[PDB]
PDB file of C-alpha atoms and ligand atoms in Angstrom:
ATOM      1  CA  UNK A   1       0.079 -14.640 -27.000  1.00 29.90           C
ATOM      2  CA  UNK A   2      -3.231 -15.908 -25.473  1.00 27.40           C
ATOM      3  CA  UNK A   3      -4.747 -18.096 -22.687  1.00 27.25           C
ATOM      4  CA  UNK A   4      -8.024 -19.931 -23.493  1.00 32.57           C
ATOM      5  CA  UNK A   5     -10.481 -17.125 -24.547  1.00 32.68           C
ATOM      6  CA  UNK A   6      -8.093 -14.228 -23.612  1.00 30.15           C
ATOM      7  CA  UNK A   7      -5.444 -12.378 -25.684  1.00 32.34           C
ATOM      8  CA  UNK A   8      -2.450 -10.808 -23.802  1.00 33.65           C
ATOM      9  CA  UNK A   9      -2.407  -7.337 -25.486  1.00 32.79           C
ATOM     10  CA  UNK A  10       0.101  -5.081 -23.581  1.00 35.87           C
ATOM     11  CA  UNK A  11       2.479  -5.054 -20.557  1.00 38.60           C
ATOM     12  CA  UNK A  12       1.130  -3.264 -17.407  1.00 39.25           C
ATOM     13  CA  UNK A  13       4.123  -4.396 -15.218  1.00 42.93           C
ATOM     14  CA  UNK A  14       7.410  -6.418 -15.604  1.00 40.18           C
ATOM     15  CA  UNK A  15       9.191  -7.160 -12.238  1.00 44.24           C
ATOM     16  CA  UNK A  16      10.894  -9.993 -10.222  1.00 41.47           C
ATOM     17  CA  UNK A  17       7.508 -11.811  -9.720  1.00 39.94           C
ATOM     18  CA  UNK A  18       6.683 -12.397 -13.453  1.00 43.45           C
ATOM     19  CA  UNK A  19       4.785  -9.892 -15.719  1.00 41.33           C
ATOM     20  CA  UNK A  20       1.253  -8.370 -15.545  1.00 40.33           C
ATOM     21  CA  UNK A  21      -0.636  -8.284 -18.907  1.00 42.92           C
ATOM     22  CA  UNK A  22      -3.824  -6.519 -20.092  1.00 41.74           C
ATOM     23  CA  UNK A  23      -6.090  -9.492 -21.115  1.00 40.23           C
ATOM     24  CA  UNK A  24      -9.032  -8.818 -23.560  1.00 44.00           C
ATOM     25  CA  UNK A  25     -11.613 -11.627 -24.049  1.00 42.85           C
ATOM     26  CA  UNK A  26     -11.819 -12.064 -27.938  1.00 40.14           C
ATOM     27  CA  UNK A  27     -15.642 -12.828 -27.721  1.00 38.09           C
ATOM     28  CA  UNK A  28     -16.915 -10.444 -24.951  1.00 37.68           C
ATOM     29  CA  UNK A  29     -14.262  -7.621 -25.149  1.00 38.28           C
ATOM     30  CA  UNK A  30     -13.970  -7.726 -21.267  1.00 36.33           C
ATOM     31  CA  UNK A  31     -10.531  -6.304 -20.253  1.00 37.40           C
ATOM     32  CA  UNK A  32      -8.775  -7.831 -17.159  1.00 32.68           C
ATOM     33  CA  UNK A  33      -5.221  -7.919 -15.717  1.00 36.28           C
ATOM     34  CA  UNK A  34      -3.295 -11.223 -15.772  1.00 34.75           C
ATOM     35  CA  UNK A  35      -0.229 -11.998 -13.631  1.00 34.83           C
ATOM     36  CA  UNK A  36       2.098 -14.509 -15.389  1.00 32.24           C
ATOM     37  CA  UNK A  37       4.519 -16.521 -13.152  1.00 31.07           C
ATOM     38  CA  UNK A  38       7.081 -19.020 -14.676  1.00 33.66           C
ATOM     39  CA  UNK A  39       7.168 -21.555 -11.737  1.00 35.58           C
ATOM     40  CA  UNK A  40       4.754 -19.520  -2.213  1.00 34.08           C
ATOM     41  CA  UNK A  41       2.167 -19.012  -5.059  1.00 34.34           C
ATOM     42  CA  UNK A  42      -0.151 -21.519  -3.234  1.00 36.30           C
ATOM     43  CA  UNK A  43      -0.289 -18.916  -0.356  1.00 36.52           C
ATOM     44  CA  UNK A  44      -0.738 -15.763  -2.541  1.00 37.80           C
ATOM     45  CA  UNK A  45      -3.745 -17.429  -4.337  1.00 36.25           C
ATOM     46  CA  UNK A  46      -5.258 -18.489  -0.961  1.00 36.77           C
ATOM     47  CA  UNK A  47      -4.974 -14.782   0.128  1.00 35.12           C
ATOM     48  CA  UNK A  48      -6.259 -13.392  -3.244  1.00 34.61           C
ATOM     49  CA  UNK A  49      -9.408 -15.604  -2.960  1.00 35.25           C
ATOM     50  CA  UNK A  50     -10.208 -13.974   0.459  1.00 35.04           C
ATOM     51  CA  UNK A  51     -10.282 -10.396  -1.047  1.00 34.42           C
ATOM     52  CA  UNK A  52     -13.696  -8.772  -1.483  1.00 34.82           C
ATOM     53  CA  UNK A  53     -13.584  -4.921  -1.072  1.00 35.25           C
ATOM     54  CA  UNK A  54     -13.979  -1.840  -3.365  1.00 35.00           C
ATOM     55  CA  UNK A  55     -10.396  -0.598  -2.433  1.00 35.06           C
ATOM     56  CA  UNK A  56      -8.611  -4.000  -2.941  1.00 34.49           C
ATOM     57  CA  UNK A  57      -7.823  -5.627  -6.377  1.00 31.68           C
ATOM     58  CA  UNK A  58     -10.419  -8.504  -6.855  1.00 28.85           C
ATOM     59  CA  UNK A  59      -9.268 -12.041  -7.830  1.00 29.35           C
ATOM     60  CA  UNK A  60     -11.206 -13.686 -10.714  1.00 27.29           C
ATOM     61  CA  UNK A  61      -9.373 -17.103 -10.725  1.00 28.04           C
ATOM     62  CA  UNK A  62      -6.186 -18.864 -11.987  1.00 26.13           C
ATOM     63  CA  UNK A  63      -4.987 -21.324 -14.717  1.00 28.98           C
ATOM     64  CA  UNK A  64      -1.817 -23.563 -14.578  1.00 29.09           C
ATOM     65  CA  UNK A  65      -0.468 -24.346 -18.123  1.00 26.44           C
ATOM     66  CA  UNK A  66       2.763 -26.405 -17.746  1.00 23.10           C
ATOM     67  CA  UNK A  67       5.276 -24.272 -15.738  1.00 23.62           C
ATOM     68  CA  UNK A  68       3.230 -21.001 -16.229  1.00 22.81           C
ATOM     69  CA  UNK A  69       0.542 -19.829 -13.715  1.00 22.61           C
ATOM     70  CA  UNK A  70      -2.021 -17.162 -14.845  1.00 23.72           C
ATOM     71  CA  UNK A  71      -3.646 -15.071 -12.048  1.00 22.43           C
ATOM     72  CA  UNK A  72      -6.761 -13.224 -13.351  1.00 21.21           C
ATOM     73  CA  UNK A  73      -7.541  -9.980 -11.471  1.00 19.88           C
ATOM     74  CA  UNK A  74      -9.598  -6.794 -11.702  1.00 19.91           C
ATOM     75  CA  UNK A  75      -8.006  -4.276 -14.124  1.00 19.92           C
ATOM     76  CA  UNK A  76      -7.143  -0.748 -12.873  1.00 19.69           C
ATOM     77  CA  UNK A  77      -6.970   1.250 -16.125  1.00 19.28           C
ATOM     78  CA  UNK A  78      -6.022   4.533 -14.334  1.00 18.67           C
ATOM     79  CA  UNK A  79      -2.368   3.558 -13.641  1.00 18.99           C
ATOM     80  CA  UNK A  80      -0.776   4.011 -10.160  1.00 19.13           C
ATOM     81  CA  UNK A  81      -0.778   6.690  -7.478  1.00 18.59           C
ATOM     82  CA  UNK A  82       2.949   6.947  -8.293  1.00 19.70           C
ATOM     83  CA  UNK A  83       2.014   8.656 -11.618  1.00 21.54           C
ATOM     84  CA  UNK A  84      -0.252  11.281  -9.853  1.00 18.06           C
ATOM     85  CA  UNK A  85       2.580  12.551  -7.603  1.00 14.39           C
ATOM     86  CA  UNK A  86       4.507  15.499  -9.132  1.00 16.72           C
ATOM     87  CA  UNK A  87       8.164  15.372  -7.954  1.00 17.63           C
ATOM     88  CA  UNK A  88       8.973  18.074  -5.365  1.00 19.28           C
ATOM     89  CA  UNK A  89       5.287  19.239  -5.349  1.00 20.71           C
ATOM     90  CA  UNK A  90       2.984  16.295  -4.568  1.00 23.73           C
ATOM     91  CA  UNK A  91      -0.683  16.840  -5.473  1.00 27.17           C
ATOM     92  CA  UNK A  92      -3.570  19.037  -4.352  1.00 30.29           C
ATOM     93  CA  UNK A  93      -4.407  18.388  -0.672  1.00 30.59           C
ATOM     94  CA  UNK A  94      -8.090  17.429  -1.423  1.00 23.58           C
ATOM     95  CA  UNK A  95      -6.939  14.692  -3.893  1.00 21.09           C
ATOM     96  CA  UNK A  96      -4.370  13.470  -1.290  1.00 22.56           C
ATOM     97  CA  UNK A  97      -7.124  13.364   1.404  1.00 23.26           C
ATOM     98  CA  UNK A  98      -9.493  11.397  -0.857  1.00 22.58           C
ATOM     99  CA  UNK A  99      -6.778   8.859  -1.767  1.00 21.71           C
ATOM    100  CA  UNK A 100      -5.819   8.625   1.941  1.00 21.07           C
ATOM    101  CA  UNK A 101      -9.503   7.898   2.894  1.00 20.31           C
ATOM    102  CA  UNK A 102      -9.617   5.091   0.283  1.00 17.04           C
ATOM    103  CA  UNK A 103      -6.221   3.711   1.369  1.00 15.91           C
ATOM    104  CA  UNK A 104      -7.431   3.582   5.019  1.00 15.97           C
ATOM    105  CA  UNK A 105     -10.687   1.813   3.905  1.00 14.67           C
ATOM    106  CA  UNK A 106      -8.568  -0.854   2.079  1.00 16.78           C
ATOM    107  CA  UNK A 107      -6.117  -1.333   4.962  1.00 17.66           C
ATOM    108  CA  UNK A 108      -8.937  -1.591   7.591  1.00 20.70           C
ATOM    109  CA  UNK A 109     -10.526  -4.257   5.349  1.00 21.05           C
ATOM    110  CA  UNK A 110      -7.286  -6.277   5.065  1.00 21.42           C
ATOM    111  CA  UNK A 111      -6.536  -5.945   8.784  1.00 24.13           C
ATOM    112  CA  UNK A 112     -10.151  -7.031   9.530  1.00 22.65           C
ATOM    113  CA  UNK A 113      -9.621 -10.358   7.645  1.00 21.99           C
ATOM    114  CA  UNK A 114      -6.216 -10.772   9.427  1.00 24.78           C
ATOM    115  CA  UNK A 115      -4.139  -9.977   6.282  1.00 23.33           C
ATOM    116  CA  UNK A 116      -1.107  -7.611   6.300  1.00 23.38           C
ATOM    117  CA  UNK A 117       0.040  -6.249   2.859  1.00 29.24           C
ATOM    118  CA  UNK A 118       3.682  -5.493   3.989  1.00 30.28           C
ATOM    119  CA  UNK A 119       4.605  -3.341   0.925  1.00 31.08           C
ATOM    120  CA  UNK A 120       2.266  -0.331   0.785  1.00 32.94           C
ATOM    121  CA  UNK A 121       3.750   2.297  -1.562  1.00 31.34           C
ATOM    122  CA  UNK A 122       2.470   4.376  -4.523  1.00 31.83           C
ATOM    123  CA  UNK A 123       3.479   1.711  -7.116  1.00 30.05           C
ATOM    124  CA  UNK A 124       1.102  -0.809  -5.335  1.00 31.44           C
ATOM    125  CA  UNK A 125      -1.819   1.671  -5.142  1.00 31.94           C
ATOM    126  CA  UNK A 126      -3.614   1.444  -8.545  1.00 29.71           C
ATOM    127  CA  UNK A 127      -6.430   3.683  -9.815  1.00 32.08           C
ATOM    128  CA  UNK A 128      -9.609   2.546 -11.661  1.00 30.57           C
ATOM    129  CA  UNK A 129     -11.120   4.697 -14.513  1.00 29.95           C
ATOM    130  CA  UNK A 130     -12.985   6.751 -11.797  1.00 27.10           C
ATOM    131  CA  UNK A 131      -9.670   7.410  -9.818  1.00 34.04           C
ATOM    132  CA  UNK A 132     -10.720   4.894  -7.124  1.00 35.67           C
ATOM    133  CA  UNK A 133      -7.653   3.535  -5.270  1.00 37.97           C
ATOM    134  CA  UNK A 134      -7.063  -0.266  -5.276  1.00 36.52           C
ATOM    135  CA  UNK A 135      -4.404  -1.909  -3.071  1.00 35.84           C
ATOM    136  CA  UNK A 136      -2.564  -4.349  -5.400  1.00 35.22           C
ATOM    137  CA  UNK A 137       0.196  -7.000  -5.297  1.00 36.23           C
ATOM    138  CA  UNK A 138      -0.267  -9.672  -2.549  1.00 35.86           C
ATOM    139  CA  UNK A 139       3.085 -11.385  -3.292  1.00 34.70           C
ATOM    140  CA  UNK A 140       4.425 -10.308   0.192  1.00 35.82           C
ATOM    141  CA  UNK A 141       1.048 -10.386   1.997  1.00 37.93           C
ATOM    142  CA  UNK A 142       0.698 -12.710   5.020  1.00 35.36           C
ATOM    143  CA  UNK A 143      -1.768 -13.814   7.748  1.00 33.38           C
ATOM    144  CA  UNK A 144      -1.144 -12.055  11.072  1.00 34.18           C
ATOM    145  CA  UNK A 145      -4.478 -13.085  12.774  1.00 33.41           C
ATOM    146  CA  UNK A 146      -6.115 -16.554  12.555  1.00 34.05           C
ATOM    147  CA  UNK A 147      -8.871 -18.000  14.828  1.00 34.62           C
ATOM    148  CA  UNK A 148      -8.862 -14.544  16.570  1.00 34.39           C
ATOM    149  CA  UNK A 149      -5.211 -15.079  17.644  1.00 33.78           C
ATOM    150  CA  UNK A 150      -2.530 -12.553  16.548  1.00 34.25           C
ATOM    151  CA  UNK A 151       0.902 -13.806  15.447  1.00 35.37           C
ATOM    152  CA  UNK A 152       3.910 -11.459  15.467  1.00 33.23           C
ATOM    153  CA  UNK A 153       5.933 -11.196  12.238  1.00 29.46           C
ATOM    154  CA  UNK A 154       9.728 -11.793  12.008  1.00 26.63           C
ATOM    155  CA  UNK A 155      10.445 -11.736   8.212  1.00 26.21           C
ATOM    156  CA  UNK A 156      12.026  -8.405   7.107  1.00 25.25           C
ATOM    157  CA  UNK A 157      10.341  -7.324   3.833  1.00 23.04           C
ATOM    158  CA  UNK A 158       8.909  -4.261   2.073  1.00 19.68           C
ATOM    159  CA  UNK A 159      10.755  -1.216   0.667  1.00 14.12           C
ATOM    160  CA  UNK A 160      13.312   0.618   2.866  1.00 15.04           C
ATOM    161  CA  UNK A 161      11.948   4.184   2.498  1.00 15.75           C
ATOM    162  CA  UNK A 162       8.455   2.855   3.477  1.00 17.91           C
ATOM    163  CA  UNK A 163       9.371   0.395   6.298  1.00 16.77           C
ATOM    164  CA  UNK A 164       8.761   1.075   9.984  1.00 18.35           C
ATOM    165  CA  UNK A 165      11.827   1.371  12.228  1.00 18.91           C
ATOM    166  CA  UNK A 166      10.791  -1.641  14.458  1.00 20.48           C
ATOM    167  CA  UNK A 167      11.201  -3.901  11.384  1.00 21.55           C
ATOM    168  CA  UNK A 168      14.961  -2.971  11.288  1.00 20.63           C
ATOM    169  CA  UNK A 169      15.427  -3.151  15.118  1.00 22.00           C
ATOM    170  CA  UNK A 170      13.198  -5.939  16.572  1.00 22.29           C
ATOM    171  CA  UNK A 171      13.335  -9.756  16.170  1.00 24.47           C
ATOM    172  CA  UNK A 172       9.488  -9.810  16.159  1.00 28.09           C
ATOM    173  CA  UNK A 173       6.894  -7.012  15.732  1.00 29.47           C
ATOM    174  CA  UNK A 174       3.111  -6.429  15.258  1.00 27.85           C
ATOM    175  CA  UNK A 175       1.874  -6.344  11.632  1.00 29.14           C
ATOM    176  CA  UNK A 176      -0.682  -3.520  11.858  1.00 29.59           C
ATOM    177  CA  UNK A 177       1.582  -0.614  13.020  1.00 29.17           C
ATOM    178  CA  UNK A 178       4.011  -1.445  10.105  1.00 27.88           C
ATOM    179  CA  UNK A 179       1.190  -0.993   7.517  1.00 30.68           C
ATOM    180  CA  UNK A 180       0.081   2.265   9.321  1.00 31.61           C
ATOM    181  CA  UNK A 181       3.661   3.655   9.105  1.00 31.49           C
ATOM    182  CA  UNK A 182       3.911   2.936   5.346  1.00 30.80           C
ATOM    183  CA  UNK A 183       0.534   4.777   4.844  1.00 27.00           C
ATOM    184  CA  UNK A 184       2.189   7.785   6.646  1.00 24.67           C
ATOM    185  CA  UNK A 185       5.129   7.716   4.176  1.00 24.34           C
ATOM    186  CA  UNK A 186       2.576   7.490   1.286  1.00 24.68           C
ATOM    187  CA  UNK A 187       0.743  10.567   2.729  1.00 25.90           C
ATOM    188  CA  UNK A 188       4.111  12.459   2.953  1.00 23.47           C
ATOM    189  CA  UNK A 189       4.876  11.593  -0.740  1.00 22.10           C
ATOM    190  CA  UNK A 190       1.368  12.785  -1.841  1.00 21.06           C
ATOM    191  CA  UNK A 191       1.692  16.173   0.006  1.00 20.71           C
ATOM    192  CA  UNK A 192       5.440  16.881  -0.679  1.00 25.16           C
ATOM    193  CA  UNK A 193       6.400  14.863  -3.865  1.00 26.01           C
ATOM    194  CA  UNK A 194       9.461  13.600  -1.932  1.00 26.40           C
ATOM    195  CA  UNK A 195      10.305  10.761   0.496  1.00 24.98           C
ATOM    196  CA  UNK A 196      11.572  11.959   3.907  1.00 24.69           C
ATOM    197  CA  UNK A 197      14.469   9.446   4.358  1.00 23.95           C
ATOM    198  CA  UNK A 198      16.286   6.483   2.763  1.00 24.54           C
ATOM    199  CA  UNK A 199      15.385   4.441   5.881  1.00 26.30           C
ATOM    200  CA  UNK A 200      14.238   5.048   9.461  1.00 28.24           C
ATOM    201  CA  UNK A 201      17.595   4.227  11.180  1.00 27.53           C
ATOM    202  CA  UNK A 202      19.623   6.092  13.879  1.00 27.89           C
ATOM    203  CA  UNK A 203      22.399   6.371  11.174  1.00 29.35           C
ATOM    204  CA  UNK A 204      19.999   8.254   8.811  1.00 29.80           C
ATOM    205  CA  UNK A 205      20.409  12.043   9.333  1.00 34.23           C
ATOM    206  CA  UNK A 206      16.943  12.935   7.828  1.00 34.26           C
ATOM    207  CA  UNK A 207      15.300  10.395  10.226  1.00 34.03           C
ATOM    208  CA  UNK A 208      17.230  11.955  13.214  1.00 37.31           C
ATOM    209  CA  UNK A 209      16.102  15.416  12.052  1.00 38.12           C
ATOM    210  CA  UNK A 210      12.434  14.251  12.189  1.00 36.26           C
ATOM    211  CA  UNK A 211      12.895  12.728  15.661  1.00 33.29           C
ATOM    212  CA  UNK A 212      14.391  16.127  16.763  1.00 30.85           C
ATOM    213  CA  UNK A 213      11.245  17.803  15.206  1.00 31.92           C
ATOM    214  CA  UNK A 214      13.170  19.899  12.641  1.00 30.48           C
ATOM    215  CA  UNK A 215       9.980  20.512  10.571  1.00 34.19           C
ATOM    216  CA  UNK A 216      11.485  23.748   9.132  1.00 35.14           C
ATOM    217  CA  UNK A 217      13.337  21.293   6.809  1.00 33.58           C
ATOM    218  CA  UNK A 218      11.959  19.533   3.669  1.00 35.18           C
ATOM    219  CA  UNK A 219       9.736  17.708   3.141  1.00 36.52           C
ATOM    220  CA  UNK A 220       7.774  18.868   6.234  1.00 38.48           C
ATOM    221  CA  UNK A 221       7.945  22.660   5.474  1.00 36.55           C
ATOM    222  CA  UNK A 222       5.808  22.014   2.281  1.00 34.97           C
ATOM    223  CA  UNK A 223       2.999  20.371   4.344  1.00 30.47           C
ATOM    224  CA  UNK A 224       0.204  22.397   5.957  1.00 27.00           C
ATOM    225  CA  UNK A 225       0.024  22.250   9.803  1.00 23.79           C
ATOM    226  CA  UNK A 226      -3.181  20.058   9.887  1.00 18.71           C
ATOM    227  CA  UNK A 227      -1.923  17.076   7.762  1.00 16.32           C
ATOM    228  CA  UNK A 228       1.527  17.546   9.429  1.00 15.44           C
ATOM    229  CA  UNK A 229      -0.051  17.049  12.928  1.00 16.50           C
ATOM    230  CA  UNK A 230      -1.438  13.684  11.614  1.00 16.44           C
ATOM    231  CA  UNK A 231       2.006  12.737  10.257  1.00 16.61           C
ATOM    232  CA  UNK A 232       3.385  13.522  13.778  1.00 13.63           C
ATOM    233  CA  UNK A 233       1.033  10.798  15.193  1.00 13.57           C
ATOM    234  CA  UNK A 234       1.696   8.204  12.412  1.00 12.54           C
ATOM    235  CA  UNK A 235       5.502   8.456  12.108  1.00 15.29           C
ATOM    236  CA  UNK A 236       6.089   7.664  15.863  1.00 16.13           C
ATOM    237  CA  UNK A 237       9.164   5.438  16.451  1.00 14.37           C
ATOM    238  CA  UNK A 238       7.541   3.344  19.251  1.00 14.74           C
ATOM    239  CA  UNK A 239       4.923   1.093  17.504  1.00 12.37           C
ATOM    240  CA  UNK A 240       2.846   0.836  20.763  1.00 13.05           C
ATOM    241  CA  UNK A 241       2.580   4.707  20.975  1.00 11.66           C
ATOM    242  CA  UNK A 242       1.893   5.006  17.160  1.00 12.12           C
ATOM    243  CA  UNK A 243      -1.675   6.074  16.250  1.00  9.57           C
ATOM    244  CA  UNK A 244      -4.067   3.247  15.306  1.00  8.47           C
ATOM    245  CA  UNK A 245      -6.468   3.468  12.381  1.00  8.30           C
ATOM    246  CA  UNK A 246      -9.539   3.950  14.711  1.00  6.53           C
ATOM    247  CA  UNK A 247      -7.745   7.104  16.026  1.00  5.55           C
ATOM    248  CA  UNK A 248      -6.584   8.258  12.502  1.00  5.42           C
ATOM    249  CA  UNK A 249     -10.317   8.358  11.702  1.00  3.81           C
ATOM    250  CA  UNK A 250     -10.850  10.950  14.560  1.00  5.72           C
ATOM    251  CA  UNK A 251      -7.944  13.196  13.348  1.00  6.62           C
ATOM    252  CA  UNK A 252      -8.772  16.874  12.561  1.00  7.44           C
ATOM    253  CA  UNK A 253      -7.226  16.804   9.047  1.00  8.53           C
ATOM    254  CA  UNK A 254      -8.758  13.340   8.258  1.00 10.23           C
ATOM    255  CA  UNK A 255     -12.221  14.867   8.900  1.00  8.31           C
ATOM    256  CA  UNK A 256     -11.492  18.344   7.352  1.00  7.06           C
ATOM    257  CA  UNK A 257     -13.798  19.232   4.403  1.00  7.29           C
ATOM    258  CA  UNK A 258     -11.607  20.107   1.356  1.00  6.24           C
ATOM    259  CA  UNK A 259     -12.066  21.341  -2.335  1.00  7.53           C
TER     260      UNK A 259
HETATM  261  N1  ADE B   1      -0.326  -3.770 -12.697  1.00  4.37           N
HETATM  262  C1  ADE B   1      -1.632  -3.685 -12.870  1.00  4.37           C
HETATM  263  N2  ADE B   1      -2.125  -2.791 -13.749  1.00  4.37           N
HETATM  264  C2  ADE B   1      -3.456  -2.682 -13.922  1.00  4.37           C
HETATM  265  N3  ADE B   1      -4.328  -3.453 -13.272  1.00  4.37           N
HETATM  266  C3  ADE B   1      -3.857  -4.386 -12.434  1.00  4.37           C
HETATM  267  N4  ADE B   1      -4.489  -5.273 -11.621  1.00  4.37           N
HETATM  268  C4  ADE B   1      -3.546  -5.985 -10.945  1.00  4.37           C
HETATM  269  N5  ADE B   1      -2.346  -5.545 -11.274  1.00  4.37           N
HETATM  270  C5  ADE B   1      -2.522  -4.526 -12.194  1.00  4.37           C
HETATM  271 CL1   CL B   2       7.761  10.546  -4.182  1.00  6.78          CL
END
């Protein structure tokens, strides 16, 4: 299979929203990623064209060919953060910190252009050949600030183990604290190789245990006290008391020099 000058050479992803292909230009040998949708997409493309940052997947352009749309994007040949997390272990704290720094730089960037991602998780955090983190997949992304005016969200979306509790409990909620929460669950996964709860509900025992500060349980007992103090500020049930990214950047562990 092929599109104009490009050959589609191998599958990088095959989900609900189409397939992602490695695309190699037959002439130039340039490798890119191509998202293939058999036709919502108007919006995603509008958002993709806004994106210009070292920790966000760049958009190159699109081609309609009948019922098939082709979205051309920066390739991340390093795979996903998901593949760097050892189950039950996590990864070395200095690698976690570096990835967390890059993830915060990407999320500040998106929030600064009034975009919320809404599905931050290790599968959506891709690595380039230098292990640089790229926030990918803008199929659920939306505008939360336009003409300097914030709009609250009401659509429930994301992935239950990563979603903030307000998204299950409130009719409308602020976008930014939901993305901050999901970054906290990503940091837990990196440092513990395990997700803390199926979902942040009153009916979820592991969530109740965290609210009662039972940090002698897993996954918290595998996490050093410094990163764990940051996770205490991020995974705060009240989204107005939750730490903001400006304040994450003043955290002791965030600024701790590591191996
Ligand atoms: N799934 C993916 N794999 C590699 N690079 C990509 N760029 C966008 N999506 C990608
Ligand atoms: Cl995990």
